[PDB]
Symmetry: C3
Subunit: 102 residues, 3 copies
């Protein structure tokens, strides 16, 4: 059984305005869009800017999305951005209730 | 029974330095004051800048306040700022352990 | 029994890239390094920038560290920076799942 919640701390979900405009798979790191305040895919440019993980896939036309706001996740189940800094990747969720480990 | 904790995830409280100088009702979104570091009413200008919800009303002369730091709240019980952007309102707590839904 | 977890809300830990290059004791407030994205000692310059508390001491040569990401801690057990603003100290963890009280 390949655990996707490589942690015991209960995972909880939340809903929020989505600013994503393209098919996005589940288990994708999310960040807040500085200009609109909507949740979009985490760009990997800053550690701690990832405020959530997509729970269900998005078609790209949804006005809202569902995300995990807490819990410990398996690094391998998460869909990271191409060639993301390893340090920013390790601390992507630092500051929130989310974390991830091997 | 009109639930005010439209969620199951346990709500927890915390205390912190208040920078509010006016009667403020309970269930009000709080943000950190950039200049002083004290907690004041959330201005609705940025998504994810709301770090807490006032638990008890403030006279406006308190040096400290009590706030919920986690849990899922009913959008309707929270006292939002006049004409706040709906997207910033939906994701006001994104990044923290707090969230809110209908 | 001098409680170090002056709270009931379960404490949880996480791992992350450390940017600390000197012996650092356990129970030390951590912040994210703007330039590298690595976790380093909280400088006390901003309220809410403390994203964690060191769980185990660091020699100063580790590439990773372990930190508590949630829970309520005793202000007295935490190792604060010399002459840190009291307001920024009180709200050092505001926004995260962490808090601290007497």
């Amino acid at each position: 059984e390949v655990r996707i919640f490589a942690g015991n701390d209960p995972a909880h979900t939340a809903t929020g305005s989505s600013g994503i405009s393209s098919p996005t798979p589940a288990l994708t790191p999310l960040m807040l869009d500085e200009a609109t305040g909507k949740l979009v895919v985490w760009d990997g440019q800053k550690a701690g800017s990832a405020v959530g993980i997509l729970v269900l896939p998005l078609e790209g036309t949804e006005t809202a999305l569902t995300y995990y706001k807490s819990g410990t996740f398996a690094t391998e189940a998460i869909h990271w951005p191409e060639s993301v800094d390893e340090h920013k990747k390790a601390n992507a969720f630092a500051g929130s209730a989310l974390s991830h480990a091997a």
